[PDB]
Each structure stands twice: as structure tokens, then as C-alpha cells.
Amino acid sequence: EKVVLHPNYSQVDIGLIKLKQKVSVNERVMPICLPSKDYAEVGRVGYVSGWGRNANFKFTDHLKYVMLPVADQDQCIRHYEGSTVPEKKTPKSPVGVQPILNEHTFCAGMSKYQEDTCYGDAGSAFAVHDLEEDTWYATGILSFDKSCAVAEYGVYVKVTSIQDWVQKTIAE
């Protein structure tokens, strides 16, 4: 029906898609829940589904997922920018392009098998399974998918940062 972008979409790589009619929720279609907490604490393993490219750079025919653990924030800016200080940051990305790294984004490294997210995986939720209440939460939304296997970290924008904006957008 309509698409609304984040007001600061240069700093918060988020856009919202609204369907014409509410989708029929079943065993194959079901919304993820926006977290009430911050599950992006370092070491937490979330499942990143994706429809993006695979090891042959071919868009995957079947949906896949990986269990990427969130990495230390300082290690991630240091991996892409220079030294996590604005006056010494440099375009040090192992991939050509630079991710959007700020306080609204976290980073998840590759899994134990050196597998990561590639082109076309952006927009996929960093789904985190809360074992206490057995609910799946979109801890982050994959923003930097250009980290196929060269850059060690994929950049995910924190949903809790955008949670206030999206809820205000659902109202209208």
C-alpha cells in the first residue's frame, strides 16, 4: 500500500513497508515481535534468515539462515572505520563500501564455520530467541549486507532504537 522511510534514514537505515491488506498469518507467514529488551548484548547468538546471494553469488533459491553472534562494538567500528574516534576514523572496510555505524547499530560476526550474510540479505531480522518466554524478537535489522565473507562483521540497526518510530508509524 505505502512505503515510509526513516526520517534519518542516512543514519538509521530503516524503511517501513505497509501492505494493502493484513496478511493471513499461518505456519509459513507470521510476524516477528519487536523486542522489549536489548538482546544485542555481546555474545548473544541470533538467527539471521536471508533471501540474498550465496557462496556462488547467486540469489538463493531456498530461504537460508545463519547463527551469527553479536560482536564487540569497538571491534566492529575499528574493523570498518579507523579507531572509533571521529578524528582518526578512516575508510578501512575490507569491502569496497562503508557501513552505517552509529549508536543505533550493532554488529554480528561470522558463525563458527566462517559463514556470513551477502548481498540481498539486508532488511532481514537478526532474530533472537528468548528462551525464557519462547518468543522470537527482531533484535536488529540487517543493514550492511556487503560483508559476504570479507568483512568479518555485518552491521545490524538496533530495532529498539527504531521501536519508538515504527510504533508511531503503525498508528498512522
Binding site: 550465496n54 557462496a55 556462488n56 538463493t60 531456498h62 564455520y113 559463514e115
Partner: protein
């Protein structure tokens, strides 16, 4: 698509000299080394961390022999690949949940192994024929 008689003859001639007991194990070990996520399906094969451990694993060699035998079976029936690989595709899709792209990766790794084994005899024409063969095998083994 139908494979031309010249391409079929080239594929058969090159496969006649393929060491069935070693080439398949080499290809499977190379797949597990280059693409370490494929080691996820062979966690029952023992140590698979070091590349030397992967290539020297007896279980990996035996399973590579079985995989290369399946490749030979699909080669003898190049015109009927889905029928010959229905059971294996069902196994991989349901019992093992192997992603179809892993089959294409193993086909490419097998082509690399064949080139490594045969030197300049793996000409670009016979490589194109073998790429068609492995693409057919992977498509018949997928979905």
C-alpha cells in the same frame, strides 16, 4: 538440455581415467576445506578442523568414493538425471537438509579436482562439458 555427442564422448573419455577410489574423496575433502560450513553435515566423521585432517579422514574418503560413484551413475544416465537422482535428492532435502547450492559447490570443486588431476588435458571444451554435467547433476539433486 541434451548433451552433444562430442561432449558426451569427451566426458566419458576423461572419466575413464578418473581414480574412483581417490578423486571423490579428494573432491569431498576440498569441499569441506574451502567451504567449512559443509563440515556441519559430517560432524560424525571425526576431526575436520585442519585441512590435513579433512583430507586424511578415512570416513571422508569413503563418503567421497560413494559420492563419486553417484556421479558415475548420473554420468551413465546423463539423459535421465532426475529419475536417477530422485532418491538422493529426497534424502538430501528431507533427511539431511543439504542446501542445493552445496551440490553446485561440490560440482565446481570436483571440476577443480579433475583439472588438478589431468593438467592441460582438462581443456576448456571438456571443462564446459563437465560444467554442463555437474549443473545437471546438481539440478537433478535439488528441490
Amino acid at each position: 538440455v541434451h548433451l552433444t555427442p562430442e561432449e558426451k564422448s569427451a566426458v566419458t573419455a576423461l572419466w575413464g581415467k578418473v581414480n574412483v577410489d581417490e578423486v571423490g574423496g579428494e573432491a569431498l575433502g576440498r569441499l569441506l576445506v574451502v567451504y567449512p560450513w559443509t563440515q556441519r553435515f559430517f560432524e560424525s566423521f571425526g576431526d575436520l578442523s585442519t585441512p590435513d585432517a579433512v583430507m586424511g579422514n578415512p570416513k571422508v574418503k569413503a563418503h567421497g568414493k560413494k559420492v563419486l560413484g553417484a556421479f558415475s551413475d548420473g554420468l551413465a544416465h546423463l539423459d535421465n538425471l532426475k529419475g536417477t537422482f530422485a532418491t538422493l535428492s529426497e534424502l538430501h532435502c528431507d533427511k539431511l537438509h543439504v542446501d542445493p547450492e552445496n551440490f553446485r559447490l561440490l560440482g565446481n570443486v570436483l571440476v577443480c579436482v579433475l583439472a588438478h588431476h589431468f593438467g592441460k588435458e582438462f581443456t576448456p571444451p571438456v571443462q564446459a562439458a563437465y560444467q554442463k554435467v555437474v549443473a545437471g547433476v546438481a539440478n537433478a539433486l535439488a528441490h
